[PDB]
Structure formats: structure tokens, C-alpha cells
Amino acid sequence: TEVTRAEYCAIACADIFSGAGEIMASPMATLPLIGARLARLTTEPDLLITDGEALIFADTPAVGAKAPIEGWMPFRKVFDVVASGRRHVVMGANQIDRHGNQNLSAFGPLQQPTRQMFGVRGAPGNTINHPTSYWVGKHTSRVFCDTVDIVSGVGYDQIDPENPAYRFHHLHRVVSNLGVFDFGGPDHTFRALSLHPGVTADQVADNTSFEVAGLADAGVTREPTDEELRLIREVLDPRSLRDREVSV
Amino acid sequence: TEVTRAEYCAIACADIFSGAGEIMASPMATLPLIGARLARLTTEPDLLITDGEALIFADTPAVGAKAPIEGWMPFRKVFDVVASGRRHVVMGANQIDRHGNQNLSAFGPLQQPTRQMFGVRGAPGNTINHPTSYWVGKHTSRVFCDTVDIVSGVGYDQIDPENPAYRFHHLHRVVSNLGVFDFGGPDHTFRALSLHPGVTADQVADNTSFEVAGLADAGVTREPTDEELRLIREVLDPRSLRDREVSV
Amino acid sequence: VSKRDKRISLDDAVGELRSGMTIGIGGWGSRRKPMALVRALLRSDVTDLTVVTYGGPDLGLLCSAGKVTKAYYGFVSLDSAPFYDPWFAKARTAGEIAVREMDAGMVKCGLEAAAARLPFLPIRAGLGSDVRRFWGDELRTVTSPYPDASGKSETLIAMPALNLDAALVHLNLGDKHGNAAYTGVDPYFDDLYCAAAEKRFVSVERVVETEELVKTVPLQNLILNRMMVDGVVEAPNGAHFTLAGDSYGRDEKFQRHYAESAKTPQAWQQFVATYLSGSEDDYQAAVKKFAEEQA
Amino acid sequence: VSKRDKRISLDDAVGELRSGMTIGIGGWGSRRKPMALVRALLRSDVTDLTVVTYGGPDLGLLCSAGKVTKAYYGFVSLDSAPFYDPWFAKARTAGEIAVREMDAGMVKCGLEAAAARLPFLPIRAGLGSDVRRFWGDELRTVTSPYPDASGKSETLIAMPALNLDAALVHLNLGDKHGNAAYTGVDPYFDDLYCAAAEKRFVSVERVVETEELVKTVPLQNLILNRMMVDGVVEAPNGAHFTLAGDSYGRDEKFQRHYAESAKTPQAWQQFVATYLSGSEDDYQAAVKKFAEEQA
């Protein structure tokens, strides 16, 4: 079995949801989407998933396909799900720092940015309410920086332990084209869990602005099972749309 | 034209809504219901009315009849209407005091009543949010008492003028089988506006526990127009259900 | 690789409840109450309950069995004459229950706070009323950190979250995973009860496959999703004697018989012997016989 | 004796607006925006607006005409590539607008507070994020008067009410009195925008009699009642170039042309000359011609 970099990324995105149970999986990019649907077809059948617009799917469809539905999830109800905590989102990111602060809003000063993106969207509500993970298709030092310009996703150094309003914050994984990471290093720092086959420690270090905890000892990302490869290649992403979103 | 006591009560209940505009009329008894619908067919066509369950009526139907609908008003949406203020309710009452405190909850101590009724229902929310009026089909000193046992409807002596949360309180009318009243007497006291033809001041005084302001000078309730009599007798209440709810 | 099959019996569902729980009961007054689940509670030894409800004969039946210690409610009504529930009235006049009676809008508010995992939501309803005295220091105010334009700050009721150990609701149609729908003019608040609770049991008139469910009702009627339900009970006529949207209306004659049977110890033993001393099937058979006799 | 006839033209509706108003705009991103009403705003001299929106090309067009002083929004997105609205981006990078950017759930919350005439509602979203810095002292916290079980009291964002001078929304069907419905999978928040506003204008694809409206859609789709609307505008294709539920999808090719036309002063003058210098009918004719040319 020859396994591509995007196929390792797909199974790593499925592993984001290991143990998630009966919660709403909300991937916001193609690789996490394949991953969430792969988890649903293997070890997490109770995940809820949507069409990204307003319909909850009964079955698990291929990327871009319709499937029979099981419920209704318009935007006003998504906010109820966020506030209930019964959700795990996978967001993209223009910047992520060593403690998990994240930016998808804009670059530069808040009232006069040098470049405009979406604004904060749902990132503040996601990060304060329920498990949040991140996907980065091109792992670089511009993404993984010392300080994010605008904190749209709340990192670990923002938490007030005296205020139980912060008790639901949990940043679970960062999956990139180079490996699998979390914030389990000392002081909740960015930590390497695995590197995809063919990725070296120095490749990660050279493309991260800060020190990655446990990088020297991080093993290699697991192999996909035969079933996972079949599901990725034949069922979920037969056109290999995943490759377009995974950089060297 | 011979006009019955119930017919005077019906036009007085219509007059509750004079100047109401485009708000939800929510009568909670047959006479106020005839009154609200009579107002809608004469001088207040923009009133909203429901079937008392969940449907907003387009046309104005007879008592107990269906009519074509114009919208949806399930109970959860009624609470939104209450909080919006765009409503005038007409409630019944087991007790009403001189300042407009009202009870439909129970008699006796709060945690061990001597007689149980509905509990407070929506009376606290109604009286704090929007115009509220009352209907009493048998005006007696047991209803119009010095002190209500349980304050379900908020009266004027509960208002904190320093707290703008109280700024929407307004008790508009009390209509009974004896006359038309408000809380426009000195210190927001129960005040006579009119007595129905054939009712004397001493009849009211003998059936009210407290002094009624302006009782000696109160004139007689106006005559219905020919159109109002036609609408009451032919269109809205051809079976004279109104008579069952109006006592001597 | 399948989603969890949540189908369970009435007695199974009550077997997940425990004495001392705070339980929310769906429906409204004498409307779409989970009466089969309430009858299963009566058969059980589960007691010392704190009940959160828009009350009707559900609360009356629980009071008839002494199962209620504390009750949070916006009202108690049978919706038809005699309007007041006589078993709730008896428990009240005997001082058998501690009440946190509240404005009807405060129930919705408290359930919404729990659904959002918030400790309170502000509300105007309650201010100036004896709701304050029913609750004492359990109901506090909250002041706006923003004054109004005039410079005065509003102080409102801080409605505390109505967090529930369990919710019992009845709906018209559902699947074995807990997707469920109402038919008729009003969902009431059954979604909020489920969202406010730890353990959630829905009885339905009929269990169907998911695809049948979603092709039978509009999207907007799908008020429960799989994250809102832990057990699904198939209970045809499971709201009797309350109404149930499009499925059936209220059994007015039988509700009158329930209310009149509460008047004497003698009338109640007979009602219990005929209707409440067997299974749900026994109840349903006896109710059918009553309808035939009283024609 | 008749209910008020609220039918008015696009220009009439904008004639009720005034410079300096706070205006909420319905829809979401590039979805069911009241684009005909926005084009009527561009034709008018109404400016210095404070805009509350889930932003899309509505906000972009207003920025292209310098009509925005302050903006409250949960995001700005075109939903399709190039995703970011280039006119909003230009106003931001030039410092032309003061922003009260917020979590998307805070918009809903603030509109709900206004709808209920409350000064704030508590919410978790915003805590720990740069939402605090966007707002400074305009966004304060509120502490629960009830500690959690551990004895610690939660301090939450006090989302202030997003009270609006006016709301502009577009729906699929309505009557001359303001009863109105959406068709398709999402109402967005148009009911909340109307409930939060003083003056409410709804454009609809088609005006029908009330009985036709209520027989065409389910009850649950009737999101506006007569107390929520002050003027009704019949504007077929009035959401173009955003999508509109069951009526039509997004004009993706034209939205791309809008975005690419913002790149140079030259491209924009031509877009203005062709699409934004006449009436709505002129716009609609030019958009139809564009579709034919680009096949």
C-alpha cells in the first residue's frame, strides 16, 4: 500500500473525533470533512453531520453529494448547538500561536487592518463553548507565529480559572500537512504527537516560529486501515479533491 | 332600542381597545372576546386576534367559530409578544384591590392555600410588560377587596420609579357587570368612569370593599350604535352566550 | 457500524429515573402530556420528585401518589372544566409540596438558560409580583451594566437555569434514534425540556424509520435530533387523556371522570382499581371500554 | 373598515430612512439579502449609517458609496470565492469605518435582547477573545447572582441590545399587510431584525392575498406578522445577486463580476454606469443581458 500525504491527513482528521460520541462534527474544510465522515463510517457512527447549510444528514455522503436527511439545522439552531457544548468544530486558521490563540479575522490593527479576512465568525463562541480543533494545509512560520494579530479563537493563556464561564474551553488537535499536534506541552504549549511519513523534525522546526514540544521524540502517523483507504478512495473522495488542499 | 346589560358590557369591552392600534388583543373571557372582535370590526381593524390556541385570524369570526388565518402564534411566540409589549390582555380576576393588584393564583398562604386556582399563569408578565385590563362578570366585595391574597397581577403600589424595568406597567380598564372603571383616581386608585344604565352609585358602593373614586359624579355608559348592536346580535354572538357571563 | 438503538419500554425508561430527581415534564396543561410515562412513574417506587412543568393532569396524578416534594410551574390547568386539577389542589391545601410558582414566561426562560448552560437569564416577568415571595432568596435580581438613555440602570429578575436530571416528553412521530416530530399547531416546549435535561425520554405515537419520518413532516416540525434524546418509547395513545395535535383531541369525558373521581377516597380507589393498577395496555383497554359505555 | 395597506416602492421605503440611522440588514452573507433595497439606498443621499448585519455584498455596496460610519457584524463573507468582500476590505484597510466586530452568536443574542426590550443578555461567546478589544468599554461583563455548585460565580459577556432605527429584509412571499414567509431551508434571522427595529421594511418576491399566502406555506414559515412590518415592497429578483431559498440560487457569475469590478477605479465606474445608475428595472435588465452574454 502506497499512501499519499493527503491520505495520512484524512485519517488524522478522522482521529480528531475519536471518542467524540453523539455530538455534532463541524469540519470547515475538505480534509477535516473527509475525516469526520470517515470517522462516522468507521468508529464514530453516532456523530451528527450536516450539509454545511441547514440539513442534518442521516447517511454519510461523498464530498459534495447529497444524502437522505435526519433533521434540521438552520443557522439559528447552530448557535443553540454551540451553546449546548455538544459539538466539535474543525476550523482553518490564518495564524495559530504556541498557546492556541487563533486568527481568521484580519491582519494588522483592529480598526485599520492591513488585510481583511472574514472577521471573527463563530471562532470566539466555538473556542469558549466546546472542543475545537484546527486544520492547516500548508504548515509555515507565517501561520504558526509567536503572536496572532487578532484573537478570534481563544487560546490557553486567556483562561481565567476563577471564572467557571471558561470551564468548557478545550483545543483538541491541530492537524497539518506535516503532522498531528495538540496543546499538551508544558504550559499548554503546541506539542507534536506524530509526523506524517517522510516528514522530518527539522522540516517542522523550520516551518514553525516557536519551539514545538516533544518534536524530537514524535513518532510517525499511523497507517490507514485497508477499510479506511477504501472509504477515502472509493466512497468519500473518489475525485481526490483532498489532494488540492494538502501542500508539500 | 332595548339594550341589555350584557350588550352594554360588550361595547365597554370594545372600548378597552380604543386607540390600541396594531397590537395583539388577548381577551381571556367571552365578554372581552366579543368586545375585542367588535372593536376589530368597527374602529380598530388593525388589532391582531387569535383562536386562543395558536392561530392568528385574518377575518373576525363569531364566538367559537373558525376563520381564515393570517399567521402562527404558538405559546412560545406568545411569550415573545408579551416581552415586545405589543399587546393588550383582558384577564379575569378572583380579587382586585384598590391599586390594581390582582389575584388568580390561590386563596390563603402561599405554601398552603385554603383554595387553589390556576397559579399566577401569565399575569405577572402581562402586568409588567404591556397594557392590561380586567373583566369581572359579578362585581362583589369579595372580588374588589382591600388586600389580595396573592399578587399575580402587579398593581400601582408595587412600582419602583427608580427602576426603568417597571416603565411599561399600565392597567387600562376594569369592566364589570356594574360599570367601567380605571385606576385614574388619586394615587392610582380605582375610579368610576361610567355606570351601566340602571346601576346606581350605592349598588357599586355596596359591592366594593373600598371607596370608588368619582363614583358620585360618574355618568352612564354610552349607548351602542345601531351597527354595534347588529354586530353583537347577528354576527359575533347570535346565541347570546354573553348573557351567561353577566350577572345581576 | 450503526447508530445506537434507543428503543425501550415505559417501565425501562422509568427504571432509569431515581427518587429525588428533578424531572421536567413536557406538553402544556392538558395538552400532549407524556401520560403513559406518568402512569409508569405511578407504578414505580420513584418518589420525592422535584417537578418542572406547565402543569396539568400529569402533576395531578403524581400528587395523587405523593410523589412530588417540590414543584416549579407557570400554572396548573386541566384546560377544560373543572379547570383546576383537584389532586394538585389537594396537595396544595394540605401543604404537601413546596412550590416555586412563577410567571409562565419564566418557565421558558429558565429552560432556555439551562439549554445554553447559563446560570441565569434576565427577564421582566416576576418583578413586583408575589413570584418574589414564592421563591424568596432562591430568586434574585440582576442589574444591567448599561444604564438606559436617561442614566438609570434596569434591575431585572435573574431567572435561574431550570437544570433537570430528566425530561419526559411525548411526540407524534419519531425514529429509533430519537429524531422526533410534532404534528399539529404547537410544539409547546418539548425541545427545551430535552435540552435542559441530563436524561431524556421521548414517547411517540409511532416509531418509523428516519426516512419515513422526514418525508412525513416539514423540516420545521423535526424538533428533536439525536443529541437531545436518550430513550425512545413507542406508546400509541400515550398522551391520553390529554390532546395530541393531529393524532387525537382531548378525551373530555374521561378527563371529567378523572377529576370527579378525586373527590372521595371511595371514588379514587375505584379509579385506581380500574385504570391505574395494571399495565398501559390494561389502561388503554379500560379507557376504550369507558368510551363505549358513556355513549 | 380595513387593515392598513402597507405597499410602497423601493424609493418610498428608503425615503423613510434618514442619515445617521442604525439599520439592520437581514439575510446572511450572500444569502437572501435585500439587495434591491440596498441599491435604492445607493441611489439616495442617506449616509452616515450604523449597520448591523451578518455581512455580505450588502455591506460591500454600502461601503462602495461611503455610506457606513460604524458596523456591527459577526462576519463579512461572499460565501463563494473570492469569499472576502473587496469593498468592505477597502473600507477596513482605509480606516473608513469603526467596527464593533463580534462573535456570530452575539448578533443573534443582541437582536434577541432588543426584541424583548431588554438592555442585555448574557452570553459566553466573546470571553477571552479580541471581541473585547473591538468594543472596549461598550462591551461589559455581568456576574451571575447565583454561584455555581463549587461556590464560584460566573462572569459572562453582557451583550447589549442591538436596537435598530430600521430593518431591511427580503422574503419570498407576503401580503400587503406585512404577513410574510420564507421558502427554502433557512429563515436566517429576519424576524429578529424586524422585532429589534422601529421602522421595518420587507421586500418580497411577490405580494399575494393573505389567504393565498397561508395556503402556500406551512404555518412555521410565516415568520412575520402584521405587528412586525411597516412597509411592504414587491421586488421580484430583489435579492439578486444573492440566493433566495426556493426562488433562485446565487448568481455566481455576476457576483464574481461585482467582486472583480471593485479592483480598479476604472472597473468600478463601468460597473456603476451599467448596473447602479438607473432604476431597479434597469439593473434587472442589465443583469439579464450579462447572463446571456456570459453563456
Ligand SMILES: C[C@@H]1CCC(O)=C(C(=O)SCCNC(=O)CCNC(=O)[C@H](O)C(C)(C)COP(=O)(O)OP(=O)(O)OC[C@H]2O[C@@H](n3cnc4c(N)ncnc43)[C@H](O)[C@@H]2OP(=O)(O)O)[C@@]12CCC(=O)O2
Ligand atoms: C454560524 C456558525 C456558528 C458556528 C461556526 O463554527 C461558524 C464558523 O464560521 S467557524 C469558522 C469557519 N471558518 C474557517 O475556519 C475559515 C478559516 N479560513 C480558511 O480556512 C482560509 O481559507 C485559509 C486560512 C486556509 C486561507 O486564508 P487566506 O486565503 O485568506 O490567507 P492565506 O492563504 O494564508 O494567505 C495570506 C495572504 O495574506 C498576506 N498576508 C499575510 N500577513 C499579512 C499582513 N500582516 N499584512 C498584509 N498581508 C498579509 C499573504 O501574503 C497572503 O497573500 P498573498 O497570497 O501573498 O497574495 C459559523 C458559520 C459561519 C459563521 O460566521 O459562524
Ligand SMILES: C[C@@H]1CCC(O)=C(C(=O)SCCNC(=O)CCNC(=O)[C@H](O)C(C)(C)COP(=O)(O)OP(=O)(O)OC[C@H]2O[C@@H](n3cnc4c(N)ncnc43)[C@H](O)[C@@H]2OP(=O)(O)O)[C@@]12CCC(=O)O2
Ligand atoms: C401563555 C400565555 C401568556 C400570556 C397570557 O396572558 C396568558 C394568561 O394565562 S393570562 C391569564 C388568563 N386567565 C385568566 O384571566 C383567568 C381568570 N380567572 C377567571 O376568569 C375565573 O373563571 C373567575 C375569576 C371568573 C372565576 O374563578 P373561580 O371559579 O375559581 O372563583 P369564583 O367564581 O370567584 O368563586 C370563588 C370560590 O372560592 C371560594 N373562596 C373565596 N375566598 C376563599 C378563601 N379565602 N378560602 C377558601 N375559599 C374561598 C368562594 O366561596 C367560591 O367557592 P364557592 O362557589 O362558594 O363554592 C398565558 C396563557 C396560559 C398561561 O399560563 O399564560
